[PDB]
């Protein structure tokens, strides 16, 4: 199937530059143009420009002329966006999105790369179990979870059982603590009857701090 | 550039209802060489990347359900969803690509459903966290509707203030509910001064507040 795999989240300081990547697979990268679009919050999209992967030339929005630079490496079928002179206003998710030709819509979008521009240094989270107990049971069901506390910047990703457990999961939006660090929780509801035979592990990734934690969550 | 304006900012409907949303361009988006309006619509579900629904103002992208239809001309465009499904909750964006590409601000489509009271759970701090000097107590409100809910933390029946934070999820794409997590954070020293840790929950589906609690160290 078609895929556009973008590189992971990054934290960068004001004034620095950043380069991110977008790898095309399941199709030949030459057959489609590649756009880059910023999403600063959920109700905002802004176009940066478009790359012709065949030639390697680009056309830029006037807003991003001299701020963004698009390139391509065809041997690895990978496109790149470099942003320079970064300010706090450049923090956003950046999407790559393919376009067949002039009259087409942006028919497939990558998963986005989150860039945070900040003077604050990275901090990795502590991961603590939220253990099921008699006060986290509701009629044959038990809730359990992980608390991912004190990190910077966003995002933290959480999976359960390496992605084998998705039903009944709620991974909450992070809260910003007064310290300027984030905290989030991720919970799941499961049968109380099988707490002794099933294993529940939350897999927490925080790329900017190199945190990769697997925490087993057992009844207290 | 060409400015795109969407209305309304958000709307909420029950599954099965028809919805219309508006996209207005500041000038024509008609491309003369092919006589197409270079106008696209995208659907962006929570936590996902945008998906292309419509291009040329009215041509449905392959795989897009028939219930999504784009119409309009000149500077006035419309997206109609003929029979809204629970999974259609999303922000819908319009996009002109005649000139330097610009997007509308989005219409957020939310789903209405029957009242559902939360299932409430409380979690003491982990022993691992306690060893480090801090106690976080978590109250979970699962799968409720509507989204308004209130949590009050009580410590041996004393109402707490200033020491908790909460957040609510996006709406669920299958059952149209929300969930909420609240964390009460105390120093370990303060945590061990008290016995009963309670979260008291008020919500439309409850006729009286529900309290879930534990006794510390038991």
């Amino acid at each position: 199937e078609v895929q556009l795999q973008q590189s992971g989240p990054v934290l960068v300081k004001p004034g620095a530059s950043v380069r991110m990547s977008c790898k095309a697979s399941g199709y030949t990268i030459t057959d489609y143009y590649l756009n880059w679009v910023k999403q600063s919050h959920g109700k905002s999209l802004e176009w940066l420009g478009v790359l012709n992967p065949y030639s390697g030339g680009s056309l830029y929005s006037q807003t991003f002329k001299g701020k963004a630079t698009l390139t391509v490496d065809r041997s690895s079928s990978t496109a790149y966006l470099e942003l320079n002179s970064l300010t706090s206003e450049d923090s956003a998710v950046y999407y790559c999105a393919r376009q067949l030709g002039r009259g087409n819509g942006l028919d497939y979008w990558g998963q986005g790369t989150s860039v945070t521009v900040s003077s604050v240094s990275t901090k990795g989270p502590s991961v603590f179990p939220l253990a099921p107990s008699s006060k986290s049971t509701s009629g044959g069901t038990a809730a359990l979870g992980c608390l991912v506390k004190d990190y910077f910047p966003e995002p933290v990703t959480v999976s359960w059982n390496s992605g084998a457990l998705t039903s009944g999961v709620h991974t909450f939006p992070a809260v910003l603590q007064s310290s300027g660090l984030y905290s989030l929780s991720s919970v799941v509801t499961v049968p109380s009857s099988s707490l002794g035979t099933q294993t529940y592990i939350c897999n927490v990734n925080h790329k900017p701090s190199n945190t990769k934690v697997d925490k087993r969550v057992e009844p207290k | 550039n060409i400015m795109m304006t969407q209305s309304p900012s958000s709307l909420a409907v029950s599954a099965g209802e028809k919805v219309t949303m508006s996209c207005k361009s500041s000038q024509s988006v008609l491309h003369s060489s092919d006589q197409k309006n270079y106008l696209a619509w995208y659907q962006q579900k929570p936590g996902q990347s945008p998906k292309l629904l419509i291009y040329w103002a009215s041509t449905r992208e392959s795989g897009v359900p028939d219930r999504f239809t784009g119409s309009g001309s000149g500077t006035d465009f419309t997206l109609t969803i003929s029979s809204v499904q629970a999974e259609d909750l999303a922000v819908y964006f319009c996009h002109q690509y005649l000139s330097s590409y610009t997007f509308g601000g989005g219409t957020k489509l939310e789903i209405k459903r029957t009242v559902a009271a939360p299932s409430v759970f409380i979690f003491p701090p982990s022993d691992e966290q306690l060893k480090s000097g801090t106690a976080s107590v978590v109250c979970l409100l699962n799968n409720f509707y509507p989204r308004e809910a209130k949590v009050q933390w009580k410590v041996d029946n004393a109402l707490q203030s200033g020491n908790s934070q909460e957040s609510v999820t996006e709406q669920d794409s299958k059952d149209s509910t929300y969930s909420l997590s609240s964390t009460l954070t105390l120093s370990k020293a303060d945590y061990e001064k008290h016995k009963v840790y309670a979260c008291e929950v008020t919500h439309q589906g409850l006729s009286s507040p529900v309290t879930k609690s534990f006794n510390r160290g038991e």
């Binding site: 143009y33 030339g57 056309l59 006037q62 | 550039n1 491309h31 060489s33 005649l98 000139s99």
Partner: peptide, 11 residues
């Protein structure tokens, strides 16, 4: 103009 830039770029 920019519309023409896009026409040329996509040719």
């Amino acid at each position: 103009d920019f519309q023409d830039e896009l026409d040329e770029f996509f040719k």
